Ligand binder design. Structure first.
Ligand SMILES: NC(=O)OC[C@@H](O)C[C@H](NC(=O)[C@H]1NCCC[C@@H]1O)C(=O)N[C@@H](Cc1cnc(N)[nH]1)C(=O)N[C@H](C(=O)O)[C@H](O)c1cnc(Cl)[nH]1
Ligand SMILES: [Mg+2]
Ligand SMILES: [Mg+2]
Ligand SMILES: [Mg+2]
Ligand SMILES: [Mg+2]
Ligand SMILES: [Mg+2]
Ligand SMILES: [Mg+2]
Ligand SMILES: [Mg+2]
Ligand SMILES: [Mg+2]
Ligand SMILES: [Mg+2]
Ligand SMILES: [Mg+2]
Ligand SMILES: [Mg+2]
Ligand SMILES: [Mg+2]
Ligand SMILES: [Mg+2]
Ligand SMILES: [Mg+2]
Ligand SMILES: [Mg+2]
Ligand SMILES: [Mg+2]
Ligand SMILES: [Mg+2]
Ligand SMILES: [Mg+2]
Ligand SMILES: [Mg+2]
Ligand SMILES: [Mg+2]
Ligand SMILES: [Mg+2]
Ligand SMILES: [Mg+2]
Ligand SMILES: [Mg+2]
Ligand SMILES: [Mg+2]
Ligand SMILES: [Mg+2]
Ligand SMILES: [Mg+2]
Ligand SMILES: [Mg+2]
Ligand SMILES: [Mg+2]
Ligand SMILES: [Mg+2]
Ligand SMILES: [Mg+2]
Ligand SMILES: [Mg+2]
Ligand SMILES: [Mg+2]
Ligand SMILES: [Mg+2]
Ligand SMILES: [Mg+2]
Ligand SMILES: [Zn+2]
Lengths: 60, 99, 125, 206, 127, 83, 24, 155
RNA sequence: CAACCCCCGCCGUUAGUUGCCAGCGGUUCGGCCGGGCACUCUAACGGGACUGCCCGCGAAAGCGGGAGGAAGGAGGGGACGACGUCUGGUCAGCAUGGCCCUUACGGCCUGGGCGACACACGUGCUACAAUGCCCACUACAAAGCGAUGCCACCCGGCAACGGGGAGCUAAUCGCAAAAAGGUGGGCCCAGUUCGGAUUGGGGUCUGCAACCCGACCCCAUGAAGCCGGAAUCGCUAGUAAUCGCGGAUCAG
RNA sequence: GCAUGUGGUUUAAUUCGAAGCAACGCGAAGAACCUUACCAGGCCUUGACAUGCUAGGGAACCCGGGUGAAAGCCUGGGGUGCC
């Protein structure tokens, strides 16, 4: 999550295919969930805080 | 004639709201097919717990969108004029299609 | 039953039998037994002498087969090396060609494993 | 790598979410990020007022941000001015009809997130860390509470050797699900580095 | 005129309808023996009758959905027993010995993370 | 291979330099970076230095080397053996 | 024969369809 | 089993003869939970047996087990030097279990091309007193009283 | 620790659509239509189990055995990790003390690399076949996913796929063939109708672009491998073994 | 035999961490360019991003040419709002 690449992330690029997601929070490139625009770290964190609505902890 | 779908995350509020609608349609002159429990669509998420390595521990989260149908056959006017005066739970979405 | 150069084996059904020729695999064979109209299920030693001839006609003439095919494949790789293209070098050095890993496996291309020395890891011995 | 976030565990059983709305896959992504931009700002702009929770309820193009605050005047402002400024700046960053109301945390001694903070400040202001804690836990039990616990961890004092201080009274049953247990976390930022304060407050068996 | 019993077994649900007469049996619009074409276990499904001696004194209209055919078998097999009692409450006495009224609680176990299979742990081998 | 509907791919700006070199009958060295370009029969007999990640290496184009892409003639990594 | 891309099993496992395991 | 003694599984009776032994054998034949194929390999092997002998396969079966059941065996003990091979008598169950296993294992050795036959033949041979089913019984019983010099290190 | 929470096993009450079909009316034989919610189910609240009952042992706690019961002695599985240990892991998620760079260790790009290969280990896939392999016909799942997408059905094509095009913001429309299984027929112990590496050739799709380095289809090639040395792993019941199915990330 | 990870070695670079159990289909729940942190080459220097400040020139913004692998570099025109 170097600063430039978070910005580059947003720049609509020369080709449709250099489209890639980062975390709306940390900017992490790698484990980013479509649906939240968050990584699997941030997901975990915000989920526990209670700030992802209707997101319960599973158990079956 | 009037068909109400009820989709929300919390099933207490979702179920409550649908009682507020089975009764609304009673005290206005009509018969009703009750609040029907449509199946519920779960979205799971399976995150590695730690930040770095350690793949052999995850945590399981889910996202449960609950679904209730309700039908009011023989739909009067004293019905509708008691429905656009309700709204009482926040995390419940309503969609009405006269089919 | 001498076709294409090689005696295909009797006792074995014709739909199989033809596989033993170079340019014939499962499909080309069963295509040939249609186009010449023959129950494939019958053994090779149970053929009309002229049934056999029909088979020899078709098979030997349409497809580029046997050592005559070994020719083209051979001189195809030969082209590639002479060209001096990547796939060329890979062919030359006896490495994989279609782009596999080489840090492990890649054995069918390099034959058996020429073990060499190596070092002492990780703490001491 | 030990204990579970006491809230997310109790969540849905004895503790509620800070955002309550529905959204399909299409919309959710952004109403989320929109909440986080709200909670990003009000958190910066209201540290002075001691703020516990930022509730975000939602309709359609409607947002009911309930802000839960120790000193509710500081949020309001003299004349009624400061709140108007927020509501406009909110409805700016949101571009929707922001409905910001204010709610008086009547007792900051039973708000974990606040107890946490009050300690962190104290730690930043260079106060004695051990005392700071016993005296916080103190104040918490004095006000009804059935159990409480504070954990400061990091470079305590100047300290080359980063250690951990902690203290508790009553019951703080982290395994008991029906236990209402408030958790809060504060981060103290210091010349020598950064330390973390967790505060657990056991509030009642349900 | 009929006697019902609802037999389930491990993601299978069987609907058993009993009507006295010959001995023939339909499952899902086919003959019992045509549905379970070459399954040995199949015969076991009609053990609840044979152990009260009412095989032949009945017919069966049955439907199953869910599970594999064997799962369906022990579900029918339950369902018939469940039905022989709505007909004759004294049959319980004959069936409970071999326990034909017992819902097999056994079912597929949740795959658990960090295993390959719920139990099948991944291999530790060498050092 | 490349789908047959969309023909073959050459970067317009390499194809450019050659047409000017052909429609003037000049045989002056070219340098490019686009390894990724196919080889139309228009390139034949020319010499193209191509990038291999470090330098441009000349690639005399003969007839038989047409179906391919330029990159096939400048390897990208350097190998000797293991010592 | 799950590695054999000329069988039903072959395509079953590769998740593809072909001559040797067609749709309808 | 460290706390309790493990309690033997009660098998379901066979679907044709009723003998639980039948089933026990069947299970040992099957693999990969392929119980249907197994039964078929069993019951078809009975047909060959009922054919080529005339009597009842159930009993040729229940006989071919007595003639593979080993009356005692060697187990292992280590004392004060190394490991002297110790003899020791074999329980009710362990006999029955060793038998079924050995029947199948060496039935599967036979040259016969087809399974049902291979079972049918070994299930016949052994039922008489020949074939490597018994020769691996007459083996574990051999070492029973060939190392009876060490038969005082017992448990 | 246990318990309060979730899932599974039995029954209840409320609920009848997009689910269900038991008797009945009409049928183009499709629950298709009438009609009905019985049943299945769906999913929200509840009941039920306490060593309660009987026998035996025991001061007691509790243990063994039996009866009724769907379930019996924690009924099966989950979530839940004590004070602390490891100067454990991570400054490359984020945050942060201190040190270091600032026309360079910052930033943009194009190309290359992370994919290199005398070799060695770790985890796994597919096999070495007849309790199998191939071809055809014929059954029985669950859980998810999808209106920028899933793509039914018609057409061209050996096929990947392409052109046309209906339904579906989805218990309705779709992905969707479940595979093992069943019935028929083939092969007959063979490096084979076992195995499907490797390579030659011809195509498809995505993508600005498949040389380095994509997957897929078809033809041809048909390597090692005939059950693995010393060592060594997993699992105690719906478990192991075996067989398919879905999803996240994702143009691929 | 092949798929992946790793040790090593090689390389202009083979980015980096993980190292007995508790590293090794692990961070990676998606490396052709992007990702991308490495290498080569061509580029920018209040900068791709924040809040400003002193001095001059400008409405903001919109479209076209040259050169170039792109980035960048040079250049032409339209436009005059608000207090
Ligand atoms: N985690 C752990 O405890 O060890 C487990 C296992 O890996 C051991 C490991 N074993 C092997 O390699 C063997 N296994 C098969 C391959 C080769 C080899 O034969 C090993 O390396 N042994 C020697 C080697 C050696 C001979 N000479 C120097 N300098 N080293 C060693 O290094 N001992 C150390 C010591 O002498 O202090 C070590 O720190 C130790 C302290 N206490 C004990 Cl006990 N061990
Ligand atoms: Mg940073
Ligand atoms: Mg991408
Ligand atoms: Mg764990
Ligand atoms: Mg601890
Ligand atoms: Mg700590
Ligand atoms: Mg399973
Ligand atoms: Mg389950
Ligand atoms: Mg693993
Ligand atoms: Mg698997
Ligand atoms: Mg150009
Ligand atoms: Mg094959
Ligand atoms: Mg003991
Ligand atoms: Mg009728
Ligand atoms: Mg109807
Ligand atoms: Mg319940
Ligand atoms: Mg007692
Ligand atoms: Mg507990
Ligand atoms: Mg350290
Ligand atoms: Mg890598
Ligand atoms: Mg090896
Ligand atoms: Mg066609
Ligand atoms: Mg199509
Ligand atoms: Mg089949
Ligand atoms: Mg057959
Ligand atoms: Mg060989
Ligand atoms: Mg062999
Ligand atoms: Mg165990
Ligand atoms: Mg899969
Ligand atoms: Mg997908
Ligand atoms: Mg590395
Ligand atoms: Mg580092
Ligand atoms: Mg990958
Ligand atoms: Mg790159
Ligand atoms: Mg780049
Ligand atoms: Zn993040």
């Amino acid at each position: 999550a170097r600063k430039a690449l978070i910005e580059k992330a947003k720049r609509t690029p020369k080709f449709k295919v250099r489209a890639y997601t980062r975390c709306v929070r940390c900017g992490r490139a790698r484990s980013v969930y479509r649906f939240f625009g968050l990584c699997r770290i941030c997901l975990r964190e915000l989920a526990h805080k209670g700030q992802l609505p209707g997101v319960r902890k599973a158990s079956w | 004639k009037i068909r109400i779908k009820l989709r929300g995350f919390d099933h207490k509020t979702l179920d409550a709201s649908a009682q507020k609608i089975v009764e609304a349609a009673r005290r206005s002159g009509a018969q009703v097919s009750g609040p029907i429990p449509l199946p519920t669509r779960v979205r799971r998420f399976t995150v590695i717990r730690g930040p770095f390595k350690h793949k052999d521990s995850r945590e399981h989260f889910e996202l449960r969108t609950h679904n209730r149908l309700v039908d009011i056959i023989n739909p009067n006017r004293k019905t509708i004029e008691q429905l656009m005066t309700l709204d009482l739970p926040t995390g419940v979405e309503i969609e009405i299609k006269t089919v | 039953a001498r076709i294409a150069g090689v005696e295909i084996p009797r006792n074995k059904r014709v739909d199989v039998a033809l596989t033993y020729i170079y340019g014939i695999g499962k499909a080309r064979a069963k295509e040939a037994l249609e186009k010449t109209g023959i129950n494939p299920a019958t053994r090779v030693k149970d053929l009309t002498e002229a049934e056999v001839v029909r088979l020899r006609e078709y098979v030997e003439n349409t497809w580029k087969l046997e050592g005559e095919l070994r020719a083209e494949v051979a001189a195809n790789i030969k082209r590639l090396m002479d060209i001096g293209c990547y796939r060329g070098l890979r062919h030359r050095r006896g490495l994989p060609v279609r782009g596999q890993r080489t840090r492990t496996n890649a054995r069918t291309r390099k034959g058996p494993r020429k073990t060499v020395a190596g070092k002492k890891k990780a703490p001491r011995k | 790598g030990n204990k579970i976030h006491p809230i997310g565990f109790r969540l849905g059983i004895t503790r509620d979410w800070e955002s309550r709305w529905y959204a399909g896959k299409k919309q959710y992504r952004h109403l989320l990020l929109e909440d986080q931009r709200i909670r990003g700002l009000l958190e910066k702009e209201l540290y002075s007022a001691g703020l516990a929770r930022v509730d975000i309820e939602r309709a359609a193009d409607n947002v009911a941000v309930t802000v839960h605050v120790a000193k509710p005047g500081v949020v309001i402002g003299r004349g009624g001015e400061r709140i108007r400024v927020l509501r406009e700046e909110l409805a700016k960053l949101t571009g929707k009809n922001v409905a910001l109301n204010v709610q008086e945390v009547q007792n900051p001694n039973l708000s974990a997130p606040l107890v946490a903070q009050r300690v962190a400040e104290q730690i930043e202001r260079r106060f004695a860390v051990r005392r700071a804690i016993k005296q916080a836990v103190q104040r918490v039990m004095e006000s009804g509470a059935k159990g409480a616990k504070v954990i400061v961890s990091g470079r305590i004092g100047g300290a080359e050797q980063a250690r951990t201080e902690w203290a508790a009274q009553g019951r703080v049953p982290l395994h008991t699900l029906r236990a209402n247990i408030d958790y809060g976390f504060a981060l103290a930022r210091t010349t020598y580095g950064v330390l973390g304060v967790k505060a657990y407050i056991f509030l009642g068996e349900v | 005129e009929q006697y019902y019993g609802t037999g389930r077994r491990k993601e299978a649900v069987a609907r058993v309808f009993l009507r006295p007469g010959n001995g023939k049996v339909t499952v899902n619009g086919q003959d019992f023996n045509e549905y379970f074409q070459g399954l040995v276990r199949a015969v076991a499904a009609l053990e609840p009758l044979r152990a009260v001696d009412a095989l032949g004194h009945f017919d069966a209209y049955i439907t199953v959905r869910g599970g594999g055919k064997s799962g369906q078998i022990d579900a029918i097999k339950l369902g018939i027993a469940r039905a022989l009692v709505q007909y004759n409450p004294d049959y319980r006495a004959k069936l409970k010995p071999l326990g034909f009224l017992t819902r097999d609680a056994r079912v597929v176990e949740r795959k658990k993370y960090g295993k390959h299979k719920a139990r099948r742990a991944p291999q530790y081998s060498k050092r | 291979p490349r789908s047959l509907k969309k023909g073959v791919f050459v970067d317009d700006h390499l194809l450019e330099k050659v047409l000017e070199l052909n429609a003037k009958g000049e045989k002056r060295l070219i340098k490019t970076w686009s390894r990724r370009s196919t080889i139309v029969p228009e390139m034949v007999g020319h010499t193209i230095a191509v990038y291999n990640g470090k330098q441009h290496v000349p690639v005399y184009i003969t007839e038989n080397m047409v179906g391919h892409k330029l990159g096939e003639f400048a390897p990208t990594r350097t190998y000797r053996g293991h010592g | 024969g799950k590695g054999d891309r000329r069988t039903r099993r072959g395509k079953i496992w590769r998740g593809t369809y072909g001559k040797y395991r067609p749709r309808k | 089993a460290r706390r309790r003694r493990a309690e033997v599984r009660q098998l379901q009776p066979d679907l044709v003869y009723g003998d639980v032994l039948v089933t026990a054998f069947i299970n040992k034949i099957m693999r990969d939970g392929k119980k249907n194929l197994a039964a078929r390999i069993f019951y078809d092997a009975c047909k060959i047996i009922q054919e080529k002998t005339g009597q009842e396969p159930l009993k040729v079966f229940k006989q071919a087990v007595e003639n593979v059941k080993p009356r005692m065996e060697v187990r292992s003990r280590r004392v004060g030097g190394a490991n002297y091979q110790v003899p020791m008598e074999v329980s009710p169950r362990r006999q029955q279990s060793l038998a079924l296993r050995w029947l199948v294992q060496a039935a599967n050795q036979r040259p016969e091309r087809r399974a049902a036959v291979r079972i049918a033949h070994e299930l016949m041979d052994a039922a008489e007193g020949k074939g490597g089913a018994v020769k691996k019984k007459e083996d574990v019983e051999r070492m029973a009283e060939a190392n009876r010099a060490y038969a005082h290190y017992r448990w």
